[PDB]
Design a protein around this ligand. Structure first.
Ligand SMILES: COc1ccccc1NC1CN(C(=O)c2cc(=O)[nH]c3ccccc23)C1
Ligand SMILES: COc1ccccc1NC1CN(C(=O)c2cc(=O)[nH]c3ccccc23)C1
Ligand SMILES: COc1ccccc1NC1CN(C(=O)c2cc(=O)[nH]c3ccccc23)C1
Ligand SMILES: COc1ccccc1NC1CN(C(=O)c2cc(=O)[nH]c3ccccc23)C1
Lengths: 302, 302
């Protein structure tokens, strides 16, 4: 037992991290096969970020202006191109450590592991969710751009995120590996609103099921509710509406604990309206929404 | 910015994980050079755990009874010995992926990353602390024994923990890599008390400094206190007494934020006595104590 915010083992991704420098700007790149993927803002100066014309800025760059280093060895850049907000630097050597991989555009409410890197060197790994407002609550400092988010399915790494920027609320924005930002964000220095940070209801319910599997059962009540009644309370607390598809997704956890999904909704409705009363659930004093039903099942069964 | 429970990149440790089977028992081993380290309870049946005589049980085992598998390849066991609560299985092949390493016995209040493994395959990585009561709050299921805890200092892995068991409170107990348990725990099926789970005060203060660096400043007040006055309140809440050595350790964070250590103690005293009033600090509704002052500096500077 026990329940922690667990990340995937990062080894497969560590073997893909390189340093990319253009002028005075250094950030991280992801080396897969003979291509290095990195944020296109590597070509920008601080002044350029106020109103960058990436097409015009990129024309002043040649292959030899992109310095790519893998550990202590320099890679030779034989091509470059921009795809949405990422650059693809073709190198003359295929990464010998390229794992089996896919590029996926993750859905809001889903989770992934981030390997935070600086100067092409991995520094830490943590788990996060793609919030409904398409931001992540990461931990990224100066030089972290190009760090990636991923999931692992046995031996295949599904890359889903590349880090590009930090927004005014302290939250982070980035793209999928095709260079398309998650959400309405743009790689420019303009204050950008993420919008209401709604709570991932199905994930809160999954985490309440994890708590029950772990013996934390104080919050269970003798009540039930309906989807429509629960959602009237969910709306008030900026929780995502719970759908029948979410109920179906919670099926296995509901059956494992013997607690019907709508009975768990009634418990969550009471927790929202009355609070925790100074009590905790799985070592937390707030309702946690960054664990999917898959994450809970994986962590509670193997 | 941002502050997450961040673990070290696990790649170096993933290359050391093997599966060890003895009879019907399978768990994980740590393969470093030509030795595989694993919990000695791998030799036990469920019945043996009620009152095991490890010396007598181990005499009925020969090298060929320990099946060690590294991925899909079987390693040849050419020796075995017991050191405290670990077995050391000498194999005929040195692990080609053996990183630079040390075995360290971590101090209570310090943190480390755990690579949770099952059947010799890494499943997840998370960060935790060696609690003052020498337990960890991990996430470990059946088959997780032999998973290790470690820290990384550039290219050197300091192994500090090997997983052995789960206690009645849902917390975990284990040994250093010399096989000595942290705390009073024994590898037998008897209900074992961990004692009062005291809060790591210096770590709470480090985390309050992290919150201030991250713009969360609501809890700062116009007060100061003394070590002796603060400790009178700390005792009441089962917090560890704050010493001058802890104040010295918080020196760099105090100076970075311009908030004197005793001024931060006054804020923590008010948080303990009055609560959070429904507010959060770094996305938490309770005072977090599993980040050391080193962890905060590393995550806030690089
Ligand atoms: C003016 O620069 C931009 C403007 C608009 C968009 C992007 C940039 N630059 C990019 C963002 N960069 C960082 O390194 C970074 C990322 C981060 O998540 N948090 C930070 C905190 C402090 C200092 C830097 C960062 C490079
Ligand atoms: C805080 O975000 C903005 C605020 C006002 C206007 C624009 C933004 N967004 C963009 C995204 N940026 C960063 O990633 C970034 C770049 C940097 O050089 N230093 C930072 C320090 C702190 C937080 C972010 C950054 C600037
Ligand atoms: C009766 O066995 C013991 C008695 C005293 C001491 C040890 C054992 N066995 C060991 C402990 N094992 C596990 O696999 C394990 C570890 C864990 O942390 N949590 C669990 C939860 C559920 C089922 C198993 C575990 C093997
Ligand atoms: C809960 O711990 C005890 C309770 C009463 C008496 C003894 C213990 N301690 C020991 C340490 N054990 C385990 O690691 C363990 C072994 C197992 O086979 N199944 C478990 C299921 C749940 C939690 C722990 C275990 C038994």
């Amino acid at each position: 037992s026990g329940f922690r915010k667990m990340a995937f083992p990062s080894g497969k991704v560590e073997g893909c991290m390189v340093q990319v420098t253009c002028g005075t700007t250094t950030l991280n790149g992801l080396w897969l096969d003979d291509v290095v993927y990195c944020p296109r803002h590597v070509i920008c100066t601080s002044e350029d970020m106020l109103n960058p014309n990436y097409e015009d800025l990129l024309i002043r760059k040649s292959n030899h202006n992109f310095l790519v280093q893998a550990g202590n060895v320099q890679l030779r850049v034989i091509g470059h191109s921009m795809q949405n907000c990422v650059l693809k630097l073709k190198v003359d050597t295929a990464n010998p450590k390229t794992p089996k991989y896919k590029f996926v555009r993750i859905q809001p409410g889903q989770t992934f592991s981030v390997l935070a890197c600086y100067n092409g060197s991995p520094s830490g790994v943590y788990q996060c969710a793609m919030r409904p407002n398409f931001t992540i609550k990461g931990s990224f400092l100066n030089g972290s751009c190009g760090s990636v988010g991923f999931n692992i399915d046995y031996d295949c790494v599904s890359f889903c995120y590349m880090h590009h920027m930090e927004l005014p609320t302290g939250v982070h924005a980035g793209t999928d590996l095709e260079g398309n930002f998650y959400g309405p964000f743009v790689d420019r220095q303009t204050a950008q609103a993420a919008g209401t940070d709604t709570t991932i209801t199905v994930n809160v319910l999954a985490w309440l099921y994890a708590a029950v599997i772990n013996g934390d059962r104080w919050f269970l009540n003798r009540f039930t509710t309906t989807l429509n009644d629960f959602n009237l309370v969910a709306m008030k607390y900026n929780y995502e509406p719970l759908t029948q598809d979410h109920v179906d997704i919670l099926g296995p956890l509901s059956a494992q604990t013997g607690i019907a999904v709508l009975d768990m909704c009634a418990s969550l409705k009471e927790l929202l309206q009355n609070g925790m009363n100074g009590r905790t659930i799985l070592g937390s004093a707030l309702l946690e929404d960054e664990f999917t039903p898959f994450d809970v099942v994986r962590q509670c069964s193997g």
